[PDB]
Each structure stands twice: as C-alpha cells, then as structure tokens.
Amino acid sequence: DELDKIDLSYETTESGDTAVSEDSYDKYASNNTNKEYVCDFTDQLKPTESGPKVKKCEVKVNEPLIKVKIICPLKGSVEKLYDNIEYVPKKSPYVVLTKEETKLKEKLLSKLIYGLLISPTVNEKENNFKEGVIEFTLPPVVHKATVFYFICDNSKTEDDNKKGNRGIVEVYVEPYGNKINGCAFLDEHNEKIKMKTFFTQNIYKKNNIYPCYMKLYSGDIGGILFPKNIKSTTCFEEMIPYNKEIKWNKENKSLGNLVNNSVVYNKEMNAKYFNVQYVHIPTSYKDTLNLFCSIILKETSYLVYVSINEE
Numbered sequence: 001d002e003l004d005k006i007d008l009s010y011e012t013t014e015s016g017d018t019a020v021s022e023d024s025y026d027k028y029a030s031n032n033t034n035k036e037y038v039c040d041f042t043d044q045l046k047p048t049e050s051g052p053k054v055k056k057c058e059v060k061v062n063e064p065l066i067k068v069k070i071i072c073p074l075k076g077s078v079e080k081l082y083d084n085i086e087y088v089p090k091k092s093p094y095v096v097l098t099k100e101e102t103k104l105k106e107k108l109l110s111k112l113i114y115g116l117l118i119s120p121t122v123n124e125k126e127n128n129f130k131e132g133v134i135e136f137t138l139p140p141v142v143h144k145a146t147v148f149y150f151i152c153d154n155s156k157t158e159d160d161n162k163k164g165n166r167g168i169v170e171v172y173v174e175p176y177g178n179k180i181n182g183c184a185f186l187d188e189h190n191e192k193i194k195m196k197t198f199f200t201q202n203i204y205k206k207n208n209i210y211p212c213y214m215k216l217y218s219g220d221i222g223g224i225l226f227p228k229n230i231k232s233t234t235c236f237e238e239m240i241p242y243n244k245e246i247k248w249n250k251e252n253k254s255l256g257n258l259v260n261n262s263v264v265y266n267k268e269m270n271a272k273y274f275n276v277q278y279v280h281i282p283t284s285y286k287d288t289l290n291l292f293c294s295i296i297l298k299e300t301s302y303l304v305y306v307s308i309n310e311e
C-alpha cells in the first residue's frame, strides 16, 4: 500500500543541494528524557544571512524500547520562515534513508529492524511529517547495528538575504539483547526466520505440547508474537490469577493495574507489520504473581501463562 511504498530511484546526499561540506556540519546529540530521544527542529532551521547550515541531530541507541521522536516545522506554519521546507522520505517513518556509496537511498524501516513499532497516530494525528512529528519505538532486541536517516530541509526557503538550514537526523542503533522473554505463535523467507529466532518460546499450530509461559522478573521485558489468525486477546487488559478461584463477573484487571508502573507496548495491536505486544516490569516491583490471559482465534483458544518474580 501507499503508506510504505519504496521509491527505488530516489537518491540524495546528507548535504543535499546546500553546498555545505560534511566537515562543516553543526552536529549535536538528541535530547533524551527517560526512554524518549527527541530531535526537535522547531528552532534550528530558520533563515539567517549565513544559511544554509546543516544541523545534524544524532540519535544513539544501545538499550531497548527507546521511542524516537522527530519534530519538523510545517510549511506555511509561520510567515516567511518555512515557505519552502521539505521532508524526506515523505513516507517517514515507514520509509527511511540509508547510505549506499556516497548517496542516501530509501529503505523499509520494518525490514531493517524486526519488531519495531510504528503507531498509525501520534497524539491522535497521523504519524507522518505532514502533521509535524513522527514517532517510532525500537524493540526489545536488535541483532545488527543499523544506521538510518531523515531529512527536514529548510535550505530552499529564502527571506531577503537569509536562507534556512538543512536538518539531518542520523539514528545509530547498536545491537542489544538476545531473545525476548515470551512466546511466538508461528504458522508452520527472511521474515519467517526472524519470527523463529526472536522469542524464547516458539508455539507451532500443530503438535504443540507446552502452553505459552512467560517467566518475568523485576526489570525484565516480555513479549508475545500473536497468531496471524488472532480474533482477540485478553493479554494484557484482563489478567486472571490462576492460583485463586476464577469468577467471570469479577471486574477486569489489567497488568498495569496489577503491577504498578508496568508498561505495555502496542496494547492496541495497531502497529504496522508486527502482531506483537511487549511488557516491561519495573525493577521496583518485587511481589510475586501468577496470571493467565487468552487468545481467541478466527473460525479454539490459546491459554497464556505469565509468572512474575517466581521463587
């Protein structure tokens, strides 16, 4: 579909048309708060008499579940300042740029990093630079170093004898993690192999004997790759303690309600490509729980077991 169609002929360079040499970039780190790394070009690209400059924001990731956020001012949003701004790729963040020879060329981000989460929306607006901001969350595990780029280029905006600047985001993801504690429900080529290697327990449709068992401790990250024919799941909005009596009219209890400061990722299961959810148990949380949820298939259910801080 149009959301992520690659243009194989597109090519640019870091400098674009600015005639600014790479040895003359203004390079700086992303602004990182907890696990959100932000490249904000709101006050970096305005026309000045010494423009164009190149403003290069460097995102360096070596730990799991980092959310990257890039803010690029909209064309026409302020008088004069952004008259000719442009962003590349237009289909960011589904499409990114990577280095090939001296050039930057388009690649599918999801093919680069298995399990990366792109939500359809950012604060109830479409996840696309036309709305001013894009976001994506990196997964619990990354196997190979990956470097990719975005462009937010105001250098063609000319005001009197002033020119805007060209903004670059370089995201450098180093490898981290090995496998995700949890389960992959597989159907039984490159994508099929990844699906088999990323979770500690694989569950095949035929002749499986062990239910999904997610064993978590303080600080740990868990995850599940849900079956393709999933109809619905109560993981993790309705966990049930299976060491207590089950009453179906009891109110629902989420993992978040049961485990203070736990975080669930892609809880709506609307991220593109990957039918996954990740969970993080805080290091603070020290109690023991034994819970289960369920996965209902499309026309038959799967039981899912979660243990937290088992003695």
Ligand SMILES: *[C@@H]1O[C@H](CO[C@@H]2O[C@@H](C)[C@@H](O)[C@@H](O)[C@@H]2O)[C@@H](O[C@@H]2O[C@H](CO)[C@@H](O)[C@H](O)[C@H]2NC(C)=O)[C@H](O)[C@H]1NC(C)=O
Pocket (backbone or CB within 6 Å): 031, 032, 033, 036, 038, 040
């Ligand atoms: C670096 O970022 C902080 C925090 O930014 C906010 O939180 C991030 C996680 C991200 O979601 C950003 O979009 C947010 O703006 C900045 O601090 C804040 O500054 C703004 C504007 O002055 C203010 O409205 C907020 O109240 C401030 N505090 C918080 C907790 O957001 C900080 O200015 C940034 N520093 C630089 C040099 O850019």
Ligand SMILES: [K+]
Pocket (backbone or CB within 6 Å): 245, 246
């Ligand atoms: K009973």
